[PDB]
Design a protein around this ligand. Structure first.
Ligand SMILES: [Mg+2]
Length: 320
């Protein structure tokens, strides 16, 4: 079938700041496939700067190197080193003549700002049906955040679930003290601590997960299928935060699941991708059927309403 690709550079609804810099926009590639009868398919390739080794420029080069027509064999030549590209082409191909997709509103995790702000930001989300939250930690001193956490756990309604995200900012000693605190004062409301240590300290990450009672989730540590596989083979007992748009061919996750990966240990999250990628992911969720709130409560930075009509895709494409 014939295909086309177009780059996109979209300003974020509002700036997002991390320890690796500040970004005011998200860029990527949109793929449009069309068969001999006029049926169309769409896909999105959007690697996230800093996450993994794949770069948008490498994806663009791939797109310029591929033949004017697509086939399963041709797409099989896409380098394993370009997981977002594998995702984009795979989802694009599968969507040909299948849009729009049947999807559903899975529970979404609500984010809570660092500091005391967490105590005033959960109410609105809870009143909108969100029962899982993720609070950013490792910003203030451990003592200060622990005091806030005690108050937060006491204030949250029965049934609330809370995730703590350290964004790999704690050093080994601080992480150890935190888990000791959680082991004691932690409420059955703590779902897990996300990335307590930076990815380079994998031995410490594994050791902590194998010894502390509070569950640990890998995020920054797991971008591609290759990294997830590596952690599965290392015997990771915790959770895996899967960013499907950056992962690779969706079939690779299904293969891992048929093997040593536990479905209950997965949390599907956003890589600040567009509506095409997000809708493709929700389509995939009809099969994987998540059992934890999705880390897609990122509307503040990038809103991407699910696409419910084929014309909606066409409009997005033509607007470029
Ligand atoms: Mg995280």
């Amino acid at each position: 079938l014939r295909w086309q690709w177009r780059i996109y550079e979209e300003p974020l609804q509002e700036p997002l700041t991390t320890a690796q810099g500040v970004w005011r926009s998200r860029s990527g590639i949109y793929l449009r496939l069309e068969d001999e009868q006029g049926q169309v398919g769409y896909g999105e390739i959007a690697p996230l700067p800093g996450w993994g080794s794949e770069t948008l420029n490498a994806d663009i080069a791939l797109c310029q190197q591929l033949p004017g027509h697509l086939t399963p064999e041709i797409m099989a030549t896409i380098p394993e080193a370009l997981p977002a590209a594998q995702f984009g082409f795979a989802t694009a191909w599968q969507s040909v003549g299948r849009l729009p997709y049947r999807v559903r509103p899975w529970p979404i995790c609500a984010l809570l700002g660092s500091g005391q702000a967490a105590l005033e930001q959960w109410q609105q989300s809870w009143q909108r049906g969100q029962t899982t939250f993720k609070w950013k930690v490792g910003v203030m001193s451990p003592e200060e955040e622990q005091a806030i956490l005690k108050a937060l756990l006491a204030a949250l309604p029965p049934g609330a679930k809370l995730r703590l995200d350290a964004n790999g900012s704690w050093d080994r000693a601080t992480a150890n003290r935190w888990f000791a605190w959680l082991d004691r004062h932690g409420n059955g409301k703590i779902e897990y601590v996300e990335q307590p240590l930076p990815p380079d300290q994998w031995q410490a990450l594994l050791s902590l997960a194998q010894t502390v009672t509070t569950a640990i989730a890998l995020d920054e540590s797991v971008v591609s299928a290759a990294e997830v596989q590596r952690w599965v083979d290392r015997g990771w007992p915790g959770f895996f935060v899967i960013k499907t748009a950056l992962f690779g061919d969706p079939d690779s996750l299904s293969l891992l699941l048929r093997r040593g990966l536990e479905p209950q240990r997965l949390v599907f999250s956003s890589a600040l991708e567009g509506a095409i990628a997000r809708t493709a992911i929700f389509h995939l969720l009809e099969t994987w059927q998540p059992c934890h709130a999705l880390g897609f409560g990122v509307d503040r930075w990038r809103s991407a309403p699910l696409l419910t009509t084929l014309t909606a895709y066409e409009r997005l494409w033509e607007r470029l």
